[PDB]
Design a protein around this ligand. Structure first.
Ligand code: ADP
Ligand code: ADP
Ligand code: ADP
Ligand code: MG
Ligand code: MG
Ligand code: MG
Lengths: 164, 370, 190, 166, 370
C-alpha cells in the first residue's frame, strides 16, 4: 500500500458527491471530472489543476463530456479518475459517479505498482461510491458502450444525454 | 422553502424534492459488508456500500434489506441509507428543507417512533410528517374516491377511501409482495437446473422477474398452453454469459399474488382481499369503490395484471355493478408522485410536526398528529 | 490493478488465485504441481530419442537453458505436429558447451505442451488452460465477467513465445462466446 | 534506511535492495552435501542437490536458514540488523511456514522490522522477476512504511502477529 | 411378488428386496475407464468397472461419480450401474419384480423423467414408483411427525412432516454434503504435506474422513485444545505403508456442515436451515417439530454430531421448548429401511405407475402421480 490521500482530494470528493443549494453564477464552476496524481516524492494523492473538467462548460465548449475525457488521460502513465455520469435507463433516469482506474501497459512498473497497491487507500476514503471501472487498454476505455455495460449493463439505453 | 419527500420503501428508496414530476434519486435499499479479507491494499475499500455502488460490487458483498415487509429490522443501516440519500445522492442538508416520510398502514408504532426520533435527533429537521403510502398513491391519481391496491416489495395493503373520509376499519394488510414472489421464483427455478442460493444472485432472479414475468388471464388455459409446446418459453441473457430457458415459471410465480398457497400463506389473494374489504365497507360506498380500484407499486407492473384483477373482481362482485381497474403508466412511483403533489399543497403546510412542537411531546406526537 | 485471476507458474508449482476489487477468493485457489522442473524432466526424457542422454544433475542445467532459449508453445498442437512431420523447416541447432551441436525437432513445442496436457509426464491434473476456467467457474457468478478479461500471468514458465496466444484461444474456447478474454502478458513477468 | 526484499522462491532466490530496477542476487535455491554448497557454487560443483522448498512450503529449515544467511552475508555482504527485510509467499499457505519464517527472521538475525507479502499481489504492483519488481516498488512507498511488524511489536505478540497483521 | 427398492444415492447404491431388514447390495456408485494402454494381452480387460471391482482396481482407473448433488450428470454409466446392480449383483431380472427408486426433493423434472424412461424402456418393469429419500427415512423411524435432516453424499435437504401431511413450502435444500466435506479435507490436508489431487487418491481421503473425523461440541474450545498439545492428534495407516498425523483437521472439515463459509458457500449451516424451515412452518406444529429432528444419511454418522445439533437448536429455539435429536444407529441406510418397510405396505400397492398406465401418459405420469 503505502501512499495515502491528502486533504484536498477528500475535500474535492466531499464537494462533488454532496451538492447543496447554490447560486446560478457559482453553480457553473463545480467540478465535473477530476483526475488524481502523485507528487515529486510519491507520497500523497494530489489532483492536478491542469487537467480537469467543469460542470459549467459541459454542453458548451465541451460537446461531449466523455469524448473529451478519454484524450485527457495520458497514455504513458497511470492515472485515477472520477466521472459524474448522467445516463438514461429504460427504467428511469439516474445520475451517479464513476471511479475509473486508468492503467495502461505502456506506463513503467514504478507507476503501475504504486497505483495498484494503493488503490484500497483511496477507494476506502471515497465513501458511498458504487460504480467501479477498471480500464487497462486504451481501446476499451475509448469505447462508449463499456460505460453503459459497467453502469447498468444492457439496461442503459442512453448515456450522457444521447442514445447509444 | 422546498420540501423533501422520501419514500423509504422495502425495495427502492424514491427520494426527491417537492413540486417536480419524477424522483431524481432511485436505488435499491440494501447495505453490503465486504465478504472476503481483501488482500489488495488501498484503493478506497469501505466498510459498507449503499445503493448502486452495492449493486455494481454485489459480487464480493453480502446484500441484505434493512426493511422486512414494511417494518425496519435494523436501524444503523437504515439511518446510514438516509444519510447516504441525503448527502451522497442529493447533496443537500436535512436542516434546511422539511422531509416527508411514508409508511404502510397497520404498522407497529415503534417503527414510526424510531423514524421520528432519528429524523429529529440525528438530522435535526425543522419539520416532518409521516403519511401513508396508499393515501399518497391515491393523491397521485387526482381523485379522492376509490380503494387503493398498494403492493410494493414487502407488504401489500388495501385501504378504501371515500370523498375525503377514509375507512380505517376496512384496512387490509397482506404480507405477500415482490420479495415473496422472488423467493418463490428462486424456489421453482431449481427444478430447471439453476440454483440461486446466495443473496447476490437473488438480484439476478429479481431482474428476471421484473423483465420476464407476467400474470395470465387465467391459470388453467395458460398451463395447458405451457404443457403443450415451447411457444411460450423465452431465453434470458445472464451476466455470466449463460442462457436459461424458463417455461411456466413466467406466469406461475406471479400467480402467488392471487393464490398464496404456493409459498404457504393462508391469506386470500390480492383479488379477494379487496372484495372482502369492500364488503366490509359501507353499503352505499360500494358502488363507487367497485368502479375505482387504484393500483400502485412496482409489483402491479406485470403485463396483464390489470385484466386479471378486473375479471376476478367482476367474478366476485355482482353482475349489475361495473368494475374498473385504473392502471396508470407511472404507478411504479405513484406514492412518490402523491407525496410530491401533497407537499406543494398550501393547506397541508400547517400540519407538519415541528421541533418546537416535538420537544415537550417527545416521540409520541406522531401518533396523535398523523 | 486489483481485479483479475493470477496465473503464477514458476519452477516448482503452478497456482491460480482469483482476486476481486481487494477481496480475494481463498475457496477457489487451485494448485498444480506442474512447473518448469517437470518440463525440464520431460524434455530430458524425450531428448534421449534423438541420441542425447542427460542423466546427471549437472547436465540437466544444459537442458534447462535449452528449454529456456529454444522452446515455444504452439497455437495448436495438431497443425504444428503436421509441420514437424513434414520438413526440417522447423528444426534448429544449438551450441553445446562441449562443442557439439544438436538438432531438435518437435521437442521445441512438445515439452511445453505438458503445461496444457499433463498426461505426458503422467499427471492427471487438467492443464493450465483448464484449471483457470474451473476456478473461475467455482467463483461467484458476478465476478466472472471481470475475471475472464483479466488473466494476469507471471513466472519464468510463462515466458515461452506464443503461450499468451494459446492461453487466450483456449480460454475463449472454454468461456462463453459473448464474454471477451484478455491475457495480460507483461514483458517483466519473469 | 533502505529495505531488503527477498523473494524466497521455490527455484530461485531473488534478493536485492529497495528502489532499484533489477535484483542483484539471483541463484538456484539448493544445498548440496558431498556425495555444504549453496547457489552458484553448488551449480558449478559430486553433490546431491535438493530443494528445501516444495510447492511453496519450506520442507527443511536448517538449509533454508543457511540459504538466508548465505544470501545475506556471502552474496550481499550486508547485516540483517540494519535494513528491514521483506519476504514473499504464495496464498493458501500453511500458517506454520509463515510462523517459522517470522521466528527465524526475528530470533536468528534480529531484524528491526519485516513483512510477509503475497507474491501475486507484488507481481501486480509491478504492472503499475515481476514479484521482486513489485516488492521493490512497494518497499519505497511511504504509506507502507508504517505497517512493518517490528521487534518491539513482536515481543508481546509472539510469532502469531503475522496472521493478524499481514 | 416381492418388490425391489433401489436407493440410487450419490455415493452408494443400496439395493435389495422388500420385507428384509438390511440391504444386501452396497457399493460405491462410480465407473472407471482404463487410464493406461494395457500392454498385457488378455486376462479379461474390460471397458468399465463398477462398484467393488472399481474400488479394488482404482489404481489404474479414473473414478468419477455419475450423480452430482442429486442430479444424474451422465446417463450411459447410470443405466450401466443399474444393469450391474440388477444382473451382476442381485442376479435377478427387472421384468418380474417392481422396482422402487428414490430421489431428493427440489429435483429437476428431467432427472425423474429420464429415470422413468430408462426403467420402462430398457428394463421394461411391470411397475415402479419414485419416492422421496427423506420421507422414506422418516418411515424407517416408525413415526409420522417430525422434520427430517437427510444429508447424503451430494445433497442435504430438510422437509418437515406432520401427522401425515408434509409441508412442501418449507422444503429446504443445501448443496453441502459429504463430497464437499471430502473436497475441503483434501484442500486442508495439503497444509500438512500430503497432496491428494487425483480421483483415485481422493477415496483414501474419503475413508479417512469416514473413520477419523468427528464433530466438536463447540469449535472454539476444541481449537484451543488443538492448539495446545498433540493430545488430539491421531495417526492413520495408509495403503502405501506411510503414516500421517492429522490434528485440527479431524474436527475442522466436519465443521463445514455448520459453517459453509469454509468451502465458500453462503448457505446457512445444517443447524440454521432446520430452524429457518421450522420458523417457516405453521405455528402450532413447531412444538412437535422441535422435539422431533430425525437424522439420516451417512454424513450424520460423525461422533458428536447429534450433541452439537441439539445444542445449536436449543440455542436457536426458545428456552421453554425442548429439543430432541433422534440419532438411530442404522441411520446410514434409513432411506433403504423406509423404502423396504414402505414396499410391504398393502395400501401403497395400488399407486405404482404401471406400463399400461405409462403408455398413453408418456414420461410425464410421474409428476402427476408421485
Ligand atoms: N417491470 C416490472 N415488472 C414486474 N415487477 C417489477 C417491475 N419493476 C419492479 N418490480 C417489482 O417491484 C418491486 C419494487 O417495489 P416498490 O414499488 O419499489 O415498493 P416500495 O414502493 O415499497 O419501495 C421490486 O422488488 C420488483 O420485484
Ligand atoms: N526465456 C524463458 N523461456 C522459457 N522458460 C524460461 C525462460 N526463462 C526461465 N524459464 C523457466 O522458468 C523457471 C524459473 O521460474 P521462476 O519464475 O524463477 O520461479 P520462482 O519465481 O518460483 O523462482 C526456470 O526453471 C526456467 O525453466
Ligand atoms: N462412519 C462414517 N462417518 C462419517 N461419515 C461417513 C461414515 N460413513 C459414511 N460417511 C459419509 O457418508 C457418505 C455416504 O452417504 P449416503 O448416506 O450413502 O448418501 P446416499 O444415501 O445419498 O447414497 C460418504 O460419502 C461418506 O463420506
Ligand atoms: Mg411501497
Ligand atoms: Mg515463483
Ligand atoms: Mg441419500
Amino acid at each position: 500500500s503505502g501512499v495515502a490521500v491528502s486533504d484536498g482530494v477528500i475535500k474535492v470528493f466531499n464537494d462533488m458527491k454532496v451538492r447543496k443549494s447554490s447560486t446560478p453564477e457559482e453553480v457553473k464552476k463545480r467540478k465535473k471530472a477530476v483526475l488524481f496524481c502523485l507528487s515529486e516524492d510519491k507520497k500523497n494523492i494530489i489532483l492536478e489543476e491542469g487537467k480537469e473538467i467543469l460542470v459549467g462548460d459541459v454542453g458548451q465548449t465541451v460537446d461531449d463530456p466523455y469524448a473529451t475525457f478519454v484524450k485527457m488521460l495520458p497514455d504513458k502513465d497511470c492515472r485515477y479518475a472520477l466521472y459524474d455520469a448522467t445516463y438514461e435507463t429504460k427504467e428511469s433516469k439516474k445520475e451517479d459517479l464513476v471511479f475509473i482506474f486508468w492503467a495502461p501497459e505502456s506506463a513503467p512498473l514504478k507507476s503501475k505498482m504504486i497505483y495498484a497497491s494503493s488503490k484500497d487507500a483511496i477507494k476506502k476514503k471515497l465513501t458511498g461510491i458504487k460504480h467501479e471501472l477498471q480500464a487497462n487498454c486504451y481501446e476499451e476505455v475509448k469505447d462508449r458502450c463499456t460505460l453503459a455495460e459497467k453502469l447498468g449493463g444492457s439496461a442503459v439505453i442512453s448515456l450522457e444525454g444521447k442514445p447509444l | 422553502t422546498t420540501a423533501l419527500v422520501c419514500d423509504n420503501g422495502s425495495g427502492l428508496v424514491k427520494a426527491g424534492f417537492a413540486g417536480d414530476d419524477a424522483p431524481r434519486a432511485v436505488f435499491p435499499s440494501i447495505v453490503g459488508r465486504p465478504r472476503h479479507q481483501g488482500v489488495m491494499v488501498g484503493m478506497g475499500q469501505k466498510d459498507s456500500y449503499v445503493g448502486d455502488e452495492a449493486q455494481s460490487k454485489r459480487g464480493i458483498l453480502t446484500l441484505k434489506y434493512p426493511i422486512e415487509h414494511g417494518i425496519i429490522t435494523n436501524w444503523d443501516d437504515m439511518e446510514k441509507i438516509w444519510h447516504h440519500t441525503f448527502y451522497n445522492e442529493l447533496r443537500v442538508a436535512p436542516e434546511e428543507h422539511p422531509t416527508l416520510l411514508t409508511e404502510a398502514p397497520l404498522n407497529p408504532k415503534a417503527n414510526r417512533e424510531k423514524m421520528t426520533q432519528i429524523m429529529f435527533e440525528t438530522f435535526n429537521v425543522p419539520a416532518m410528517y409521516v403519511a401513508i403510502q396508499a393515501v399518497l398513491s391515491l393523491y397521485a391519481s387526482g381523485r379522492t374516491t376509490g380503494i387503493v391496491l398498494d403492493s410494493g416489495d414487502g407488504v401489500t395493503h388495501n385501504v378504501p377511501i371515500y370523498e375525503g373520509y377514509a375507512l380505517p376499519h376496512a384496512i387490509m394488510r397482506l404480507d405477500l409482495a415482490g420479495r415473496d414472489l422472488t423467493d418463490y421464483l428462486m424456489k421453482i427455478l431449481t427444478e430447471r437446473g439453476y440454483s440461486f442460493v446466495t443473496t447476490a444472485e437473488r438480484e439476478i432472479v429479481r431482474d428476471i422477474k421484473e423483465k420476464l414475468c407476467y400474470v395470465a388471464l387465467d391459470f388453467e388455459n395458460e398451463m395447458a398452453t405451457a404443457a403443450s409446446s415451447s411457444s411460450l418459453e423465452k431465453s434470458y441473457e445472464l451476466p455470466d454469459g449463460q442462457v436459461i430457458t424458463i417455461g411456466n415459471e413466467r406466469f406461475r410465480c406471479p400467480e402467488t399474488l392471487f393464490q398464496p398457497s404456493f409459498i404457504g400463506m393462508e391469506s386470500a389473494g390480492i383479488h379477494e382481499t379487496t372484495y372482502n374489504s369492500i364488503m366490509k365497507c359501507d353499503i352505499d360506498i360500494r358502488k363507487d369503490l367497485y368502479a375505482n380500484n387504484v393500483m400502485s407499486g412496482g409489483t402491479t407492473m406485470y403485463p396483464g395484471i390489470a385484466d386479471r384483477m378486473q375479471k376476478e373482481i367482476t367474478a366476485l362482485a355482482p353482475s349489475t355493478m361495473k368494475i374498473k381497474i385504473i392502471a396508470p403508466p407511472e404507478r411504479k412511483y405513484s406514492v412518490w408522485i402523491g407525496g410530491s403533489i401533497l407537499a406543494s399543497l398550501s393547506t397541508f403546510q400547517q400540519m407538519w410536526i415541528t421541533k418546537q412542537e416535538y420537544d415537550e411531546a417527545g416521540p409520541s406526537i406522531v401518533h396523535r398528529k398523523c
